[PDB]
Design a protein around this ligand. Sequence first.
Ligand code: INS
Ligand code: FE
Ligand code: FE
Ligand code: OH
Length: 258
Amino acid sequence: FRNYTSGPLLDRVFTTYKLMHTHQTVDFVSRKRIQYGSFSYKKMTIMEAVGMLDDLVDESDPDVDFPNSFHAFQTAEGIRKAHPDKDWFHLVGLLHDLGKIMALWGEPQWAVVGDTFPVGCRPQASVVFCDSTFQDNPDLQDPRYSTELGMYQPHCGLENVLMSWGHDEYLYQMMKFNKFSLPSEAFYMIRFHSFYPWHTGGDYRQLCSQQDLDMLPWVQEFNKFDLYTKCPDLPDVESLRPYYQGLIDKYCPGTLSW
Ligand SMILES: O[C@H]1[C@H](O)[C@@H](O)[C@H](O)[C@@H](O)[C@H]1O
Ligand SMILES: [Fe+3]
Ligand SMILES: [Fe+3]
Ligand SMILES: [O-]
């Protein structure tokens, strides 16, 4: 799992992180936040959006080579079986990767999927391929962003950090805009679930607040289902749909703005 030294997909995953690192700059993230922050691209229900991902495969994932819609159901199912008393958490599983619809809207996948990292400051060691994929990034030539803290004050809190643009931040802002009625923990887990250097690699604590640290266990708990439920054996989506539609009706019903 999560093997970046070996694997049959390693070729397309290295290409995709080298290209996203080489191009996720402060300006770019700043533009994309505006480009998508009005959620005026499409109107859809959750299940519509999930079904859109019937038409999408993730090019950064070394563990998956099937429509990402299925992965949504697998993650929700893993969570549901381990945390029966937390239905909202089951939904988070289904919802967490819906931001990848951007790839169907013409975005290059390096601007949609993959591990995230803060722009505006020096990449730390636990960033996938850090040593070999950042040399062509203009921000690093910029004294404003080349240092450890870069443009940030210490412990500013991750909510005040500009993350590399992708499905995490898109979906987080989407849910705020539509006013999903999930607990704070849900919004936070989704917003930072891709931030491996932080929740796994132990890095970027120079930017974290005590609030962020307190959320670490929640992100890590979601993460283990996010990652380890990935399997070629697909779920019976038709059978599962009604259960998850019930949760959708409770937490984020009807047509939403994307
Ligand atoms: O390849 C995976 C996939 O893109 C996940 O959706 C994302 O959250 C992870 O950070 C990434 O490593
Ligand atoms: Fe994800
Ligand atoms: Fe995922
Ligand atoms: O994920």
